[PDB]
């Protein structure tokens, strides 16, 4: 018997502003269904306090997608609309099983390309330095595929305990704060006028080396706010 995330109060504000996609982007459960007790092995309340996401398979996901609150439709905002768009979370990333290589846990996505992905990464060299078992940001500065289209940053090594995140977008600039420390005024002006941006959070499994290996991510808190 699995306990539903909506059975406690902690996540109700964000569930009232999200739909769930599982196991792919095109298969979704509405905000109303989430508030109404949606539960499964992919999305349940773990140890009485964690909104836990689980997913296996290449490019599969169990992920919340920002909606207009109170039964509204899909949100679309712009990096240059003058409003500050903020996402906060507290995440416990447990040890990922063999075959899981990268798990995107928060995003700014849009109808064009992902402006930002915060992901757990097993192993990567960045600007001549090797990092392992760590949290990375990937920001797009163009629409191409080569590395010049991205800015990748080591944010923090994965910790045993909960790790807090804050993503702030205002006036075409991005700030990321991890455990209260600023880790990224990153320019987003390439995306000026893109009116389809939205936040996501959960687990999106990228480039696994086993199709059966299950990514698993635990949220102690998640909120998205517009000021
Ligand atoms: O930097 C290196 O050294 C290596 O980079 C390798 O290329 C990377 C890119 O740098 C990006 O990380 C790129 O991110 C992709 C994701 O792989 C994934 O396709 C994602 O998919 C979106 C998609 O838009 C879809 O519509 C839906 O929204 O799901 C996804 C989402 O929710 O975000 O889109 C990202 C993107 O396009 O920005 O991934 C590649 C990669 O191959 O993994 C590579 O060049 C390697 O050789 C380098 O060593």
Q: State in Å: Cα 114 to ligand 1 middle.
A: 9
End-to-end Cα distance, the chain: 39
Q: How was this structure determined?
A: X-ray
d(CA 214, CA 55): 5
Q: State in Å: Cα 226 to ligand 1 middle.
A: 27
Cβ of 147 less than 6 Å from ligand 1? yes
- Return the CATH number of 5-226, one of 3.30.1280.10, 3.60.20.10, 2.60.120.200, 1.10.3860.10: 2.60.120.200
Collapse the DSSP code of 33 into the 3-class scheme (helix H, G, I; strand E, B; otherwise coil) and give the result.
helix
Question: Which position has the token pair 């893109």?
Answer: 194
Cβ neighbours around 72 below 10 Å, total: 11
d(CA 218, CA 5): 11
Cβ of 198 less than 6 Å from ligand 1? no
d(CA 33, CA 19): 8
Instruction: Please provide the DSSP assignment of 106-140 as one string.
Output: EEEE-SSS-SEEEEEEEEEEETTEEEEEEEEEEEE
Collapse the DSSP code of 222 into the 3-class scheme (helix H, G, I; strand E, B; otherwise coil) and give the result.
strand
Cis check: omega of the bond before 23, within 30 degrees of 0: yes
d(CA 196, CA 104): 20
Cβ of 143 less than 6 Å from ligand 1? no
């Amino acid at each position: 018997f699995l306990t539903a995330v909506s059975s406690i109060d902690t996540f109700l504000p964000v569930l009232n502003e999200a739909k769930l996609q599982w196991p792919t982007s095109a298969l979704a459960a509405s905000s109303e269904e989430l508030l109404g007790g949606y539960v499964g092995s992919q999305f349940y309340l773990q140890d009485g306090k964690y909104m836990q996401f689980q997913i296996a398979g290449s490019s599969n996901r169990c992920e919340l997608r920002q909606m207009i609150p109170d039964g509204g439709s899909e949100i679309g905002w712009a990096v240059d609309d003058g409003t500050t768009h903020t996402a906060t979370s507290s995440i416990v990333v447990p040890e990922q099983v063999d075959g899981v290589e990268e798990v995107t846990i928060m995003q700014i996505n849009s109808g064009e390309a992902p402006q930002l992905r915060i992901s757990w990464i097993r192993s990567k060299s960045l600007d001549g330095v090797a990092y392992e078992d760590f949290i990375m940001s990937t920001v797009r500065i163009g629409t191409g595929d080569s590395s010049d289209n991205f800015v990748k940053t080591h944010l923090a090594d994965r910790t045993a305990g909960a790790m807090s995140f804050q993503i702030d977008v205002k006036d075409s600039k991005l700030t990321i704060t991890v455990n209260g420390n600023v880790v990224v005024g990153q320019d987003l002006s390439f995306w000026d006028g893109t009116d389809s941006c939205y936040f996501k959070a959960g687990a999106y499994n990228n480039n696994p080396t086993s199709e059966s290996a299950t990514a698993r991510i635990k949220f102690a808190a998640l909120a998205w706010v517009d000021h």
